[PDB]
């Protein structure tokens, strides 16, 4: 996250921290994720596509710090790693950038809701906030483009939803942004998601309810003028989510 504020998991209790283990025993952070039910985390395909082996992954819930333990945190393995069959990446644009991780504790259980671990609601078919709406993003992503390490503490910020019409302007992304994507940015270009924020939630308060409107997907640089964050439009993927979580 560029700009914004440090935060704690209690304010973002659906946030999942996803790591990958390496031969040698080193674990690195991979991407964000959102808990949409006790057994299911949703994230972004591009996070996993080069390493589609579920055994490599570790998911934490209730975690506020990157490399240390948070009271109440819970650790999960991945029982099923589901990538979107039609995922693809162009120079900038990532398509069908959405994934599902079925989680389970070492004892075989799914998540136990608590003060710091909660599900986030999905949106309803093609019902997204209007452009100009303020929404929040959360992640352990870079604080500056020149950074090579991630912040130790979870961050959040607030960005505004940008219309498809504006986002498809030639100085923005032209036709590379599709209707299955959502653009969001700061009107002054001072705050944004960045590398390492992928897979994490774009949350909008919709009809009184906190809704998972987007998933951090792609963009050109971070907090660049005329270059919004691009998000998977969750509301266009409800039949895919339902079909894969129904089992
Ligand atoms: C999400 C992401 C992943 C890799 C690279 C960049 C610049 C990224 O940020 C683009 C945009 C969200 N600011």
SS3 243: helix
223 touches 2 (CB < 8 A): yes
Same fold? 1-12+120-235, 13-119+236-247: yes
For ligand 1, whether the C-beta of 199 sits within 6 Å is no
Structure tokens, 198: 């992928």
Dist CA 33 CA 79 (whole Å): 15
**Residue of 214, 207, 239, 212 lying closest to 229 (CA atoms):** 214
* Beta-ladder partners of 28: 20
DSSP one-letter string for 11-66: GSTTEEEEEEE-TTS-EEEEEEEEEEETTEEEE-GGGTTT---GGGEEEEES--BS
Determine the residue of 141, 218, 225 to mutate for testing ligand 1's pocket, defined as the one with the most ligand atoms within 8 A of the Cβ atom: 218
C-alpha 7 chain-centroid distance:
16
The CATH fold of domain 13-119+236-247: Thrombin, subunit H (2.40.10)
For ligand 1, whether the C-beta of 192 sits within 6 Å is yes
DSSP one-letter string for 161-211: EE-HHHHTSTTTTGGGS-TTEEEEE-TTS--B--TT-TT-EEEEEETTEEE
State whether the Cα torsion 216-222-223-227 is positive or negative.
negative
Resolution of the coordinates, Å: 1.9
DSSP secondary structure code for residue 150 in this structure: -
State whether the Cα torsion 115-116-117-122 is positive or negative.
positive
Dist CA 158 CA 34 (whole Å): 17
88 touches 119 (CB < 8 A): no
**Which residues are identified as catalytic?**
46, 97, 198
């950038």: which residue's tokens? 97
Dist CA 57 CA 18 (whole Å): 7
Dist CA 181 CA 5 (whole Å): 26
Method used experimentally: X-ray
Determine the distance separating the centroid of ligand 1 and the alpha carbon of 140, expressed in angstroms. Answer: 12
For ligand 1, whether the C-beta of 13 sits within 6 Å is no
CATH class of 1-12+120-235: mainly beta
Dist CA 44 CA 170 (whole Å): 26
Determine the distance separating the centroid of ligand 1 and the alpha carbon of 142, expressed in angstroms. Answer: 9
Cβ-based neighbour number of residue 23 at 10 Å: 6
C-alpha 143 chain-centroid distance:
16
Give how far Cα 64 sits from Cα of 21, 74, 116, 155, 195, Å: 20, 12, 9, 9, 18
- Parse the chain into domains and list their residue ranges: 1-12+120-235, 13-119+236-247
For ligand 1, whether the C-beta of 174 sits within 6 Å is no
In whole angstroms, how large is the CA radius of gyration of the chain?
17
**Residue of 66, 71, 69 lying closest to 117 (CA atoms):** 71
């Amino acid at each position: 996250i560029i700009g914004g504020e440090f935060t704690t998991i209690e304010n973002q209790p659906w946030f999942a921290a996803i790591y990958r283990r390496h031969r040698g025993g080193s674990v690195t952070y991979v991407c964000g994720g959102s808990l949409i039910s006790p057994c299911w985390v949703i994230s972004a395909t591009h996070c996993f596509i080069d390493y589609p082996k579920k055994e490599d992954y570790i998911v934490y819930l209730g975690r506020s710090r990157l490399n240390s333990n948070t009271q109440g945190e819970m650790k999960f393995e991945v029982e099923n790693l589901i990538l979107h069959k039609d995922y693809s990446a162009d120079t900038l644009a990532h398509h069908n950038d959405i994934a599902l991780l079925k989680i389970r504790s070492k004892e075989g259980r799914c998540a136990q809701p608590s003060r710091t671990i909660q599900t986030i609601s999905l949106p309803s078919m093609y019902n997204d906030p209007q452009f100009g709406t303020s929404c929040e993003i959360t992640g352990f992503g870079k604080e500056n483009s020149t950074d090579y390490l991630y912040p130790e503490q979870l961050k959040m910020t607030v960005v505004k939803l940008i219309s498809h019409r504006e986002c498809q302007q030639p100085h923005y992304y032209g036709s590379e942004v599709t209707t299955k994507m959502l653009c969001a940015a700061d009107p002054q270009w001072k705050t944004d998601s960045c590398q390492g924020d992928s897979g994490g939630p774009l949350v909008c308060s919709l009809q009184g309810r906190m809704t998972l409107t987007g998933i951090v997907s792609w963009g050109r640089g971070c907090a660049l003028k005329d270059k919004p964050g691009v998000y998977t439009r969750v509301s266009h993927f409800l039949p895919w989510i339902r079909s894969h979580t129904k089992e």
